[model samples]
Target: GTILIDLSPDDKEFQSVEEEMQSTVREHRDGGHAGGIFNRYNILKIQKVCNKKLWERYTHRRKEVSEENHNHANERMLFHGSPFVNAIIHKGFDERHAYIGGMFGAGIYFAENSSKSNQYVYGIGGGTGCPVHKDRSCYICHRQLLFCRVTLGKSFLQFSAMMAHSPPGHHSVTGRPSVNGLALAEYVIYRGEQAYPEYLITYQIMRPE
Candidate 1:
């Protein structure tokens, strides 16, 4: 399997992911005052991760969980923004290195809104560059995040997943959008193989117009 495959602008996957991120931001701002600087994510590079072992594990878990239910597994591609770039793509998102005693006090965290994930992505330089290789000439201006495939076969949906919380004997925890709760979808998967690190995106937030 190809380990790290660089995506081209013409790639359909590339375009789809960008559109997904942008559309979420659009809804966010339209939903609220939502500041613009961090809202617009200009995706520059996308590298696909093909960890064969991880894929097998995730699929196996998905099959088991789906079977347990009526075969309606709620699987979706979500965003996990983290500084641990190389570790995630090669080794997969691990609970060990994840922010400890963190969101719900356990599990790997993910978000539906790109801005929610972008908060964790870090770059050396501020946002004042291109979405393309114009800044490919400069390494300091790039940010990174992972878009993962998560299967919440039987998730516990609640108003929110707060600090020191855990799933009430469910496969995963999903926090939905509400006035007092999370504004966007936030997921927490407590067990391993429930999620796979699918794509490593290199991107930049655009400066204010």
Candidate 2:
């Protein structure tokens, strides 16, 4: 059985985000060839696949932990209608936690960076712990990493910009965590004005428990 839910534009579910994807396409309108090329890459489709698989896994899980932390963790996250793969670029002054694909990271906005610059929007998919992990998986049985079967290179990059841990580490977000927990993916806006002009190129990831 499937469940259908309708969401109001002002509903807390969307967090007041309106016309989520309109801005992404408008950015490339000034360019002709570049805009055409970017429009060919459809990231929204990929996000749809990811969201579907995620729900499937959750619904079909045979065994589940009854811990209260699980519910609390989900609340801290926004898992509504494909937010990660929506072509729109996100920029905010304050720091907040978000998930790209399966990876988790703190979203930060820099004053020096212009909103028109090459922008990247991402979401995290946390597996178990706080600090995000890159390629390390405590449980592996079938070509799966961090609970999901994954393809490296472009797909990985799409999910995570850079895999890095917390304090006492490098300044760049480019190191994979040691533990097995989170994963991330973003519908990349390469040369925001030239690449994927109209579409949000994304992918769906699947993993085991």
Candidate 3:
């Protein structure tokens, strides 16, 4: 694979403290405000009103991080970031009550559906093909900006996976982009589109309790 670009501190330009602070403030203000999802009050209120009732419906499934489900789990997501660059898309307005955006971390996970066990690599490998899981399911998660997009006790982790899985043609119940776990093939990866090597990319086998 080619070493496309290094966005690490040593390779990127430095921003002035003023510029950094300004960007940070702008990001936070614009991120969750679009939908009430990230609003400080809404988050607390949602958890207070919803989590208690939905805890049982949402918790009974025990969302596992196996080859089949890992691709839909937020823990498997990845995103490239540095002091300046990042991989955060805008908040989905349709999910206004369940959306947030801003300075957050993201990453990818390889998901498959085979009953048999297998191994895969997730990266750029041209000429032959890009290295990914057999089922070709990948997920990206932004750490802090994650929120619930629907009702009936859906967990935030599930919502994060739904965001990552959303494709161009599909839409959620509210006509918002979804992380549609059922269909994620034909997605292509671009060089500049991914996070730089120096960024954090977590790979874990289970949900962090």
What local lDDT score does residue 113 receive in model 1, on the 0 to 100 scale?
Answer: 80
Q: Which candidate is the best by TM-score?
A: 1
Q: For residues 1-209, write the lDDT of model 3, one tens digit per residue.
A: 11212223332221221122122221122222221112111111101012222333322322332123433422212212121111222211122111122111122221221100001222121112122332222222221121111211112222233323233322111111145434221111111122112212222111212
Ranked by lDDT, the better of candidates 2 and 3 is 2
lDDT at position 125, candidate 2: 23
In candidate 3 the C-alpha lDDT for residue 162 amounts to 31
Clashes of each: 0, 27, 13
- Candidates 1 and 2 compared: the better one by TM-score is 1
TM accuracy, model 3: 0.18
Superposition error at 73 for model 2 (Å): 14
Q: Candidate 1 lDDT, tens digit per residue, 1-209? A: 43988888898988997787777653342332222254476788888888788899889989987887678668999987765667777776666645565445567788888776765554222133334543322333677878889988778877653322345546788777666343678888876678888888887667645
Show the lowest summed lDDT stretch of 10 residues, model 1: 27-36
Clashing pairs in 1: none
Residue 96 CA error for candidate 3 (Å)? 11
Superposition-based RMSD of candidate 3 using all C-alpha atoms, in angstroms: 21.0
Q: Model 2: which ten-residue window has the lowest total lDDT?
A: 143-152
